[PDB]
């Protein structure tokens, strides 16, 4: 049978899934760490124990204890991201789409889901991976892995919480796939990693960690980095906020085994409850419990790691949408709402500056106030609107992931760069927030292939680009076909910087993305902020 | 006779000047003030003794004693900037242009010459009076003031050298012309003052002096403004600057008296050979020997006079030239040349935001060379010209004078704006150095009626248009004709900030002139050099 597969954890049996009037092999639901409840709590995760008999793989797994969206309930626009799961700590499971007839051994690819480091689940339906499975040929893994406290929450010194463990999931279910993948069919030897937000800084820091860096052969990043501003923080800001959760929850303070202890006993929903309280500043895009720097999944500061090319050296392929942050003003700054064009006031403009970048002083905030007003119309509602969502995205994820991209370039064997601007015409967020954060992943996992999803045929060709891109560069390190007729994906240089743009256009090549703000914030705003 | 003229100080004898095929009366070389020589070196000035006889003024006077510059000798572009008479002491003086037959009482309009306080002559062909006396039919007068260390030498606490004097000698001749001019057919009751550079920002230091401002009507300045960065200096640096000039001579330091008579023993040279010596920063547009925030002319900071509105309220006319900054540049900074594109490398451009301006740290000059850098095309040499021409004219003339502008206008009775952009057909300078500091003087000065000299027609139209509107506005405080068919200069109100352009195309109004960079300069690199 080929659902049936003998691991070397046990034996697997999976179910046969219909996708564009064919069918695949579908292993859900797989194991890859004991579960981490009780007194695991908060611990780095343990590998499974190996069962006899077989395990039944037929349907999605239980996701992790999360914060979950209801700013607007029934609404398809922020529910496609909520758990479609019950919710539980034991959730540390993998799923794989394998096509039929079984392969021998081809691509894999390994999907990291986002959410900001407190949230996500690899159970969604824009994270099918049956039609990328199907369309491109390659076995396809989505991975799980802990998130907010369950995950991030860091008391450095201690092994009880050490923080990063959610990292550490990650890395666990690399290392099932590294050593079983071959029983599906896949090549272990060609491991792609991508993810997109969280999900592409978690890649970019499996890159950097010395642990991570021998499971896969190239890496995907959407729309993050390691180095984003939201995604990692000291040790000493850890702690500080672990305590201030144990503040909130009525715990015992006076060491670290009093907080973890009554930590432990808590229900998942009394962390999640208060989970938001611990932000050192009133902002937005900032995340409770993220990634630590450590001194051990991360030896050093991610700076001088990537400005000595401590790194993998392999190829990546990367890029940003046109309007990652009006996801971020539309949930907390004011001015914005959903049914409406935002159209901002200069008051509400400032009021929005002062939120994404909480750790300003004001000499700061004003440069920033003065590199994104037009100072001959300076009370243009719509201006304000755009130059806040610039703001966001620039800040927290465009010129963090040009500055990855150039310290990386100089010691990698091959990176390839893109801007994704197509705004999908079945859309049903507000025109004002354009090309929205996260919403190139339906278009990488396939979905306007499916026909009742109403996209054009622009955007089906567009999907079954990006997916042969994708998936190509997956199997050789170049989205390029060597013998096609079709334009060339360049080559990102230090030289010449060169990217594409993604839509439903012909490709068209651009030099240095966005580069003028971003000299603005990697290079002059934290001069300034230290200076002053 | 029309060329003799009885005034309280005594007889006078003119000359006839032919001009346009007609003929007007000149009076040249009369004394204001009593030869400031000798032991009056760097004192105040004193009236001059009125005399029995007749003055033959009939030849223009002596220059004051200043740097000459030979930086291109035989080049007219440079020389019809250099005093054209003997240089003297002896040097207080003023001229006047009379129409013929001899006015009752109709405008008056008193030309203060530039130079940067260290140079100037009233003398100067493209200084002529007689083309704007005559064809507007105004009453024209120069006067004539003592610059560098003689006119500007401070030793605050003194009364043998208390700085200022220069502009005190402005003054006694402003007092003379109100006093007088009405024997020459004058009104001194509607009598414009109007300068360029130095000259203009001495005109609105005369509009905030208490003791200038009931001596003249209305104002127009010209590339200049009164806050000017290179306009004046503390007592402190006045008086450091002073000592530092008595260092360079051997001179005894042990106090202001030993200092002040070794240097009035010294000739007139041999402070000139030494006097950019002092300068405290390698820069460029900055003058050794400028007026001083003495608490007496000035009674307080001019940011502290013009925000509280502490200055005469009337009507000012006023503008800028396109390309202020190429001047200073070819002069001193490094890559600039007279005969060449002076195409400009990165390195060089860097080195002349350094010069341009001295007193920033390094993260300033990181702020000001962000600004005007296009990062996608870094290295573009004329890209590179062009950036830091915009640089040195910003930063010290244009956006000092829109700030007196909009400081101003809250205040005051009408405000008048203009932007010169004519490139002059018969230019020798070359081409990338545009629109230069001082050669909007020439069409003010109607030079452009006069056939020998090769303007176009439409270079002579303009000329006529600008001095219309300078006398119109000199006569009524609006440069318009309200009963005319020819477009409105529209008036700069604090709301709508509008301005024209000044050329030989059709008139058009703009708005909030170089508000972007503006905003920079008088905002922004202020509030970062304090906190930092
Ligand atoms: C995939 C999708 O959104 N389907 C839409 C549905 O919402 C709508 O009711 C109808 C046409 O308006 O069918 C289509
Ligand atoms: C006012 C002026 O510059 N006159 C020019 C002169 O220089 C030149 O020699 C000749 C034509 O080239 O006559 C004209
Ligand atoms: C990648 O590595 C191979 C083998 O070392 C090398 O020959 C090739 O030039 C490199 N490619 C890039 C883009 O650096
Ligand atoms: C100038 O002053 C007059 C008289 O006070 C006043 O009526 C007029 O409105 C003022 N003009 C401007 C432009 O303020
Ligand atoms: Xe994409
Ligand atoms: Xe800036
Ligand atoms: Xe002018």
């Given at each position: 049978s080929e659902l049936l597969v003998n691991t070397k954890s046990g034996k697997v049996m999976g179910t046969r899934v219909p996708v564009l009037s064919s069918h695949i092999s579908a292993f859900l639901g797989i194991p890859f760490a004991e579960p981490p409840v009780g007194n695991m709590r908060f611990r780095r995760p343990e590998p499974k124990k190996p069962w006899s008999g077989v395990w039944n793989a037929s349907t999605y797994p239980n996701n992790c204890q999360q914060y979950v969206d209801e700013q607007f309930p029934g609404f398809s626009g922020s529910e496609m991201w909520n758990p479609n799961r019950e919710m539980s700590e034991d959730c540390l499971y993998l799923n794989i789409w394998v096509p039929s007839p079984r392969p021998k051994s081809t691509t894999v690819m390994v999907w990291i889901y986002g959410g900001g480091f407190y949230s996500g689940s690899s159970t969604l339906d824009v994270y099918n991976g049956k039609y990328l499975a199907y369309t491109?040929?390659?076995?396809?893994?989505?991975?799980?892995?802990?998130?907010?406290?369950?995950?991030?929450?860091a008391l450095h010194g201690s092994q009880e919480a050490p923080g990063n463990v959610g990292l550490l999931d990650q890395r666990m279910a690399l290392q099932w796939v590294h050593d079983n993948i071959?029983?599906?069919?896949?090549?272990?030897?060609?491991?792609?990693?991508?993810?997109?937000?969280?999900?592409?800084?978690?890649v970019g820091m499996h890159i950097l960690s010395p642990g991570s860096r021998d499971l896969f052969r190239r890496a995907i990043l959407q729309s993050g980095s390691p180095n984003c501003p939201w995604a990692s923080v000291s040790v000493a800001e850890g702690r500080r906020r672990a305590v201030e959760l144990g503040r909130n929850l009525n715990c015992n303070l006076n060491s670290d085994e009093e907080l973890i202890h009554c930590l432990r006993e808590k229900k998942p929903q009394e962390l999640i409850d208060v989970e938001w309280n611990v932000l050192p500043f009133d902002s937005i895009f900032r995340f409770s419990f993220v990634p630590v720097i450590d001194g051990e999944?991360?030896?050093?500061?991610?700076?001088?790691?990537?400005?000595?090319?401590?790194?993998?050296?392999?190829?990546?392929?990367?890029?940003?949408?046109?309007?990652?942050?009006?996801?971020?003003?539309?949930?907390?700054?004011?001015?914005?709402?959903?049914?409406?064009?935002?159209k901002i006031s200069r008051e509400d403009f400032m009021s929005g500056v002062k939120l994404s970048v909480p750790h300003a002083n004001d000499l700061g905030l004003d440069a920033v106030t003065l590199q994104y007003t037009d100072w001959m119309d300076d009370n243009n509602?719509?201006?304000?609107?755009?130059?806040?969502?610039?703001?966001?995205?620039?800040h927290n994820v465009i010129c963090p992931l040009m500055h990855f991209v150039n310290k990386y370039t100089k010691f990698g064997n091959g990176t390839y760069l893109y801007f994704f601007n197509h705004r999908a015409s079945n859309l049903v967020w507000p025109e004002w927030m354009g090309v929205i954060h996260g919403y190139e992943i339906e278009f990488v996992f396939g979905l306007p292939l499916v026909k009742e999803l109403n996209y054009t045929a622009?955007?089906?060709?567009?999907?079954?680009?990006?997916?042969?891109?994708?998936?190509?560069?997956?199997?050789?390190?170049?989205?390029?076909?060597?013998?096609s007729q079709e334009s060339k994906w360049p080559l990102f240089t230090t030289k010449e910087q060169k990217f594409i743009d993604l839509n439903t256009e012909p490709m068209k090549v651009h030099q240095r993305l966005r580069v003028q703000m971003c000299v603005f914030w990697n290079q002059f705003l934290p001069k300034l902020l230290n200076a002053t």
């Open positions: 491109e040929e390659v076995v396809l893994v989505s991975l799980s892995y802990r998130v907010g406290a369950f995950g991030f929450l071959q029983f599906f069919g896949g090549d272990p030897k060609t491991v792609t990693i991508f993810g997109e937000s969280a999900g592409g800084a978690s999944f991360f030896p050093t500061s991610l700076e001088s790691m990537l400005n000595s090319g401590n790194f993998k050296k392999t190829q990546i392929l990367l890029g940003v949408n046109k309007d990652e942050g009006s996801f971020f003003l539309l949930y907390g700054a004011p001015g914005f709402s959903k049914d409406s064009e935002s509602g719509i201006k304000n609107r755009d130059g806040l969502d610039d703001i966001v995205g620039d622009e955007e089906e060709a567009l999907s079954r680009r990006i997916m042969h891109y994708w998936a190509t560069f997956a199997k050789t390190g170049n989205p390029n076909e060597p013998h």
